């Protein structure tokens, strides 16, 4: 009944989060995580992210900064609060405070 946590990041980050204990397979065996390999494209990331948001039990969603930049339009379109989306750093790209969808609401920063 309680919500889950979802991950969209590089294989290493996804592995670390699974070790943290975030993944599960529901009644229909849908995973709540994705590894963004080079074989995966922007359309695939957008589709899986939209599925994540539509799912009512997802709760928190985590995305690497570069993946969030790649699929930024969907992040900005998503306006409701409950699907708490977070942008996280990665070894590939560092995290920067600027250009964060949540921080877009702030000018006093």
């Amino acid at each position: 009944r309680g919500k889950l946590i979802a991950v969209i990041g590089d294989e290493d980050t996804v592995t670390g989060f699974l070790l943290g204990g975030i993944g599960e397979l529901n009644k229909n065996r849908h995973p709540n995580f994705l590894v963004v390999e080079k074989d995966t494209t922007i359309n695939e990331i957008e589709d899986t992210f939209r599925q994540f948001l539509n799912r009512d039990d997802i709760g928190i969603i985590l995305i690497n900064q570069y993946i969030a930049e790649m699929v930024r339009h969907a992040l900005d379109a998503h306006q409701r609060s409950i699907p708490a989306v977070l942008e996280i750093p990665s070894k590939e790209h560092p995290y920067d405070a600027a250009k964060d969808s949540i921080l877009r609401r702030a000018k006093g920063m």
Partner: protein, 99 residues
């Protein structure tokens, strides 16, 4: 939020480096970790917070106990994978507050 993002800037880095060290001993355990998912050991519970007349949704960090990665480094990973598990649990503890 700004402070928590700054602190994540370090917690996530520490967790990622713990993972890099884990790959030093345990080898390529990412595929095993991703394949053996079973059931989430950590779930979230919705909570209500009140400011003036406005209700602010918040989250609760809650455990299930249905561990599925025990013995993962039984022979080679061991301590490094256990430390990595702890670091990413700490990172999840940070990110739930952030959410």
């Amino acid at each position: 939020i700004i402070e928590t993002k700054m602190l994540m800037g370090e917690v996530m880095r520490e967790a990622a480096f713990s993972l890099a060290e884990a790959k030093f001993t345990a080898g390529d355990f990412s595929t095993t970790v991703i394949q053996n998912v079973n059931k989430a050991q950590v779930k979230i519970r919705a909570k209500k917070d009140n400011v003036a007349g406005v209700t602010l949704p918040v989250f609760e960090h809650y455990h299930e106990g249905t561990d599925s990665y025990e013995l993962t480094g039984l022979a080679r990973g061991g301590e490094q994978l256990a430390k990595l598990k702890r670091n990413y649990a700490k990172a999840v503890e940070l990110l739930v507050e952030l959410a």
